[PDB]
């Protein structure tokens, strides 16, 4: 893959990319399509309008969108003016909103109707800076100091060149959270998409313009933001958006066909729904759909949900493992590659070390931790330089990973070094968890741990100490973290003891807990 | 009353000044008590232990306590090293504490047991400097890095002098919120507590040393810090702590001499616990206490409630209005004067201005917004250059209350100038429950308003157009809002409208939902 030049604007990119096509549908949603020409008029529109309310460029604008045509029309509008998109989460919390308002110094919000209100607490705790509130597809009525997306795209004259941005500055920030503090800025660059797409999307997936690309993963996440944005349309393919929950059901109705006259192609998802689908009753037969590729990531592909989805599709799932800061995969199977039990082998234009506890060579066949030196690299946690030392390290980036390497040159994931649970293919914290139960009133202390499933996928566990005097049931804690937690980090069971095992010091010995002790 | 020296330590002041009566209870609370002398000793060796651990003068420690005897031990130990607590509201969230120990880079933590859980979120989610939590009261087993207070307290000597401290220098941090945007941090100097407690404790309200205090506001607002800690210790006066929520029961047990062998000779309180206490059937008979002085502050006194309470009592309340700002009152009556229906008049050393919409003098009458001139006043809203210019008008500190002046000099509240709501005598901002209420589901639209309840007092009500097309009950609100806002700032009522009346822009007329259009 040659270099992007220097002087490099990602979003000009895959406009002229497809002015080939100016016709063929870029984006369809349930209500709403967007040829490629639709897609660069209201890009270079919605650039202007940015411009035309005072965002200057390298300032950042918080995307919190659902996804929808709306969605890339934002993201290459900010991008294509030289504005940094910041594309979070949209499960998250008005405090959480209120952090990256603040951390970002957002100018502006692009934002869902139906995510206006918890953006709106959001801006009314915070110190934020945000000058004008534009609303996708609005709810409820609008305030003053806000406007619709349509109106505001629909009120500027396309700008008429992209900034004269270099390849390797910022173009664009996801969030990303560990075990404890605030969730880190991952700052990436316009180059960074431009190497996954080609060395992933088209040299590893071989994704191609009649393809019809569908994602389980939203647009905000890493994984998702190639899947189903800059993957296909580095290469003219139509991409199938969804803003409702994916669900089996919501999945199938679109492998079928029942959206935009398009059945999907590829298909792109975290093992747990994989598992799910393969557990529903109305699992289409092979017949009924059109993938060609179906791709996983964000949690170990257990082998047997690979091996049940090949007997029935006639069809591998191809498991590959990359990271927010990474942007896309680093290791993969390959569509005619595939070792279930494992992540595959190197992406070519990505460097592997497994590290010791001394930073040397681990043999092979023994765990090490995971550290990837490629050129889709985040540069930094913005505002974290203590963070960023400990991850970015002259080229390479610790992925926090343990991993051990098979004679075969593939990889087998060996868990985690830093407490994370990847749940339903998603960063959850013990520790949130545990801080949640804590503050129930008969709740004297928490320990939560991974244990992995039927099907061999991690959920959170938890073990309850009681406070002695107080009445709990476990369908009272149910109600009671219901509300205060998102569904994926309910723990699967919830375990009453009279003691947990501790340190002669207090630490709680959470790998007793695992070890099954109690 | 004569300034304070330019080396002054305001712990070192109080201490000194008890050194006559070392064996008088200085503070007693239900399960504890604390002479003069044993304060001094506790005071002075927490003021070493933090010293020990490695927090060093003018840096922050969070103090999240309940009221008890603990409690002036962290304020005066931190004070008396030179450390700077900073005092907070035991009913908040962990995402408002989280805020706090990242806005005040607090080093340390003093916490009771029962607000550990709290706590303990906040820590995990934030980006905190906390380098050591010190427990009173545990709960619950101590983490590593945690320590019991009495332990920690009995750990080290008494630090010998105090840190050399200038009577200008930052003393102590109390956070005060606005209508919209973060809690402010108002910084208070060694000198500011002097001039209160000698200014109102003992030249308006004469506090002296066989009185017996007892305030329901608690130690973390600026009046109960006065009322229950600068004032008695500034005369000798003996102290009652009350950890549990002040209900009508719980403050007339201590009335009646339920705890510590001791009957109140000072209550103070605010208009809404006064108006709650005067409807209790239980209610005692004058007889029955010791009440001499009946203090009240928090929001306007409505003279229905003042006139029962003497005519029960033979006791008036004596209604003054303080800010976190100035620190305690500016504005008050007299144990021997009192206009109900007003706030009285100037404390004497404080200079009282009205200003109308260009800033020039109001007739008598006339609404204008109050500034003050006093010693007392905070120095500045940490970290926040724009509001501390706004607030702090060279010598000047903006009230953000609108006032009329009557013809006999007393002063009658006309309403604030920026949309806060004093209910139960605590600020609550209309906006943030506002934002809450949208995230429901079932709400379209929500306008929280001030509306006065059958005693005058001024509560929020809730106006909400519910969405169409769904189900929704005055009871399913009741509960949803049960747990995601403290009791005090429950709506007393709320009505469900087809609409919201609005101009043409679309801001709500909030004015016609308190002129009862709707």
Tied chains: 1, 2.
């Excluded at 910041?86 to 308002?101: G, K, P, Q």
């Excluded at 009279?498 to 010091?505: F, G, I, N, Y």
């Amino acid at each position: 893959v040659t270099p992007p030049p220097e002087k490099f604007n990602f979003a000009e990119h895959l406009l002229q990319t497809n002015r080939v096509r100016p016709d063929k549908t870029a984006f369809v949603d349930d209500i709403s399509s967007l040829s490629f020409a639709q897609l660069e008029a209201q890009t270079r529109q919605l650039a202007a309008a940015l411009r035309a309310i005072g965002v200057k460029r390298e300032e950042r604008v918080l995307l919190l969108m659902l996804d929808g045509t709306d969605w890339p029309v934002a993201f290459l509008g900010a991008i294509y003016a030289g504005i940094v998109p910041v594309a979070v989460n949209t499960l998250l919390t008005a405090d959480d909103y209120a952090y990256m308002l603040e951390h970002s110094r957002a100018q502006a919000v692009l934002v869902s109707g139906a995510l206006h209100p918890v953006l709106k607490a959001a801006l009314t705790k915070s110190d934020h800076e945000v000058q004008r509130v534009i609303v996708s597809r609005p709810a409820a009525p609008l305030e003053p100091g806000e406007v619709d997306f349509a109106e505001f795209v629909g009120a500027h004259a396309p700008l008429e060149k992209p900034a004269a941005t270099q390849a390797d500055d910022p173009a664009f920030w996801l969030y990303s959270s560990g075990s404890t503090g605030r969730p880190k800025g991952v700052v990436h660059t316009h180059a960074n998409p431009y190497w996954t797409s080609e060395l992933y999307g088209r040299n590893t997936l071989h994704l191609r313009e009649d393809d019809v690309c569908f994602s389980a993963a939203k647009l905000f996440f890493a994984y998702g933001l190639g899947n189903a944005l800059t993957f296909p349309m580095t290469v003219g393919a139509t991409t199938l958006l969804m803003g409702e929950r994916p669900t089996p059901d919501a999945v199938f109705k679109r492998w079928l066909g029942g959206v935009g006259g398009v059945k999907p192609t590829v298909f792109y998802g975290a093992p747990t729904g994989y598992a799910g689908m393969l557990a529903a009753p109305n699992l289409p037969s092979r017949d009924q759909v059109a993938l060609r590729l179906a791709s996983s990531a964000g949690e170990a592909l257990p082998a047997e949900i690979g091996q049940r989805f090949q007997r029935h599709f006639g069809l591998d799932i191809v498991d590959g493992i990359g990271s927010t800061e990474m942007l896309a995969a680093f290791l993969s199977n390959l569509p005619d590659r595939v070792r279930y039990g494992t992540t595959g082998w190197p992406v070519p234009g990505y460097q592997i070390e497994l590290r010791g506890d001394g930073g040397g060579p681990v043999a092979d066949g023994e765990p090490g931790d995971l550290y990837i030196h490629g050129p889709s690299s985040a540069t930094m946690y913005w505002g974290n330089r203590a963070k960023s030392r400990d991850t970015f390290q002259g080229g390479w980036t610790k992925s926090g990973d343990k991993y051990v390497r098979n004679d075969d040159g593939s990889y087998t994931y060996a868990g985690r070094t830093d407490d994370m649970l990847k749940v339903s293919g998603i960063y959850v914290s013990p520790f949130e968890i545990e801080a949640t139960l804590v503050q129930h009133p008969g709740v004297l202390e928490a320990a939560v741990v991974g244990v992995a499933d039927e099907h061999g996928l991690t959920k959170p566990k938890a073990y309850v100490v009681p406070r002695p005097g107080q009445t709990l049931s476990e369908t009272e804690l149910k109600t009671f973290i219901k509300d205060r937690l998102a569904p994926y980090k309910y723990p699967r069971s919830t375990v009453f003891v009279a003691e947990l095992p501790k340190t002669a010091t207090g630490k709680i010995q959470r790998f007793k807990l695992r070890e099954g002790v109690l």
